[PDB]
C-alpha cells in the first residue's frame, strides 16, 4: 500500500512522518504522545479540518483517512488540548502539559478567540515575558526589549489609546515585580488567571432554536450553556452536569432533558447532523473527566504528583 504524508504539529513542535493507510487514530495519537513524552494524554487530541471547513477532533477508533479528513500533502494535524481541567493548579501535573496548555491558551487570548480585559491582558503579558526572558535585568533587558514580541490582544490595542512603547512600559513595570519566578511558575500563574476568563475552555457551536433565532451553544468542563449570538461571555441559560438527566440528538435536533421533572426540555438545532454528533461526543468527554476527577487518583496520577513534588524541591 502507498504511504500517506502526515504532519502533526504541537504548540512548539512539528512532527512529519508516515504511517499505514489502514491505521487507527489511536495509533497516530499513541505515536505523537510518545515522541513528545506526554503522559497526561486525557486532555489532548488531534484537531483537523474537513471537507466542509469545520475543525473537529480525530476519532481514535476509526482509520485516519476514513473520517472526513481534508485530502492534501501532507495530511495536516494539530496536537492540542481538547479538554480543560477545572483547576489548572492541581490538574496539570507535568511540565510538558503545562507548557502546551500555556502556549495554546496564550495563543487563543492573543488572537482574540478568548476575551480578556486590558488590565488583565497586560498582567498576563508580563507573566509571558517573565516566562520567556526570566528575571528582569536592567543591564541586559535594555529599553525596546519587548518591541519584537506580540504581547497584547489585537482588540485591546485597538480599544486603548497608548503608543507602542507605552504598552511595553506597562508590561515592563509588571515584569520587574515577578523577579524570582521560575518558568514553570510563571506559565502556571498565567494559566491561573486565564482559567477564570469567561470564554476559557468553552467549545462554541453556532445553533438556532425552534423559532429560528441564532444562538451559541457552549460546551465546557462544567456542562452546556446557551448564548445570545452577540454575547459569548454571559450564558442566557446554563446546564451544569448536575441539572442534566439526558442529552441527545435526532438528525438536526438536539434535546437537553433537565433533572427537574417540572422544567421543559431545551431544544436547539444544529446546521448539520455531524455537528450534533460532535456536540454529544464532547459533552460525554467532558462529563467523563468531570466524573474521573471526582474519583480517587489513579496509581499513575498519584505517582506523577509525587514526581512533581521532587522536581520542585531545591534540596539535595
Amino acid at each position: 500500500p502507498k504511504p500517506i504524508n502526515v504532519r502533526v504539529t504541537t504548540m512548539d513542535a512539528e512532527l512529519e512522518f508516515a504511517i499505514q493507510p489502514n491505521t487507527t487514530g489511536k495509533q497516530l495519537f499513541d505515536q505523537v504522545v510518545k515522541t513528545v513524552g506526554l503522559r497526561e494524554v486525557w486532555f489532548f487530541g488531534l484537531q483537523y479540518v474537513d471537507s466542509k471547513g469545520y475543525s473537529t477532533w480525530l476519532k481514535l477508533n476509526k482509520k485516519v483517512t476514513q473520517q472526513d479528513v481534508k485530502k492534501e500533502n501532507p495530511l495536516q494535524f494539530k496536537f492540542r488540548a481538547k479538554f480543560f481541567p477545572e483547576d489548572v493548579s492541581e490538574e496539570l501535573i507535568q511540565e510538558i502539559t503545562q507548557r502546551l496548555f500555556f502556549l495554546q491558551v496564550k495563543e487563543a487570548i492573543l488572537n482574540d478567540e478568548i476575551y480578556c480585559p486590558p488590565e488583565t491582558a497586560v498582567l498576563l503579558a508580563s507573566y509571558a515575558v517573565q516566562a520567556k526572558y526570566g528575571d528582569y535585568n536592567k543591564e541586559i533587558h535594555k529599553p525596546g526589549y519587548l518591541a519584537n514580541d506580540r504581547l497584547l490582544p489585537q482588540r485591546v490595542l485597538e480599544q486603548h489609546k497608548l503608543t507602542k512603547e507605552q504598552w511595553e512600559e506597562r508590561i515592563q513595570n509588571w515584569h520587574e515585580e515577578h523577579r524570582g519566578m521560575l518558568r514553570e511558575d510563571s506559565m502556571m500563574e498565567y494559566l491561573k488567571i486565564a482559567q477564570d476568563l469567561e470564554m476559557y475552555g468553552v467549545n462554541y457551536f453556532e445553533i438556532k432554536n425552534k423559532k429560528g433565532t441564532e444562538l451559541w451553544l457552549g460546551v465546557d468542563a462544567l456542562g452546556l450553556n446557551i448564548y445570545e449570538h452577540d454575547d459569548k461571555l454571559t450564558p442566557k441559560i446554563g446546564f451544569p452536569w448536575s441539572e442534566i438527566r439526558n442529552i441527545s440528538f435526532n438528525d438536526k435536533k438536539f434535546v437537553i432533558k433537565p433533572i427537574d421533572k417540572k422544567a421543559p426540555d431545551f431544544v436547539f438545532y444544529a446546521p448539520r447532523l455531524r455537528i450534533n454528533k460532535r456536540i454529544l461526543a464532547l459533552c460525554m468527554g467532558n462529563h467523563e473527566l468531570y466524573m474521573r476527577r471526582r474519583k480517587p487518583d489513579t496509581i499513575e496520577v498519584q505517582q506523577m504528583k509525587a514526581q512533581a513534588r521532587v522536581d520542585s524541591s531545591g534540596a539535595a
Partner: peptide
Amino acid sequence: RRRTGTYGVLAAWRRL
C-alpha cells in the same frame, strides 16, 4: 440505520 444518539448524564454516575 439510525441518525440519532443519546447519552444518560444522570445514569453515568457509577460512583454508587
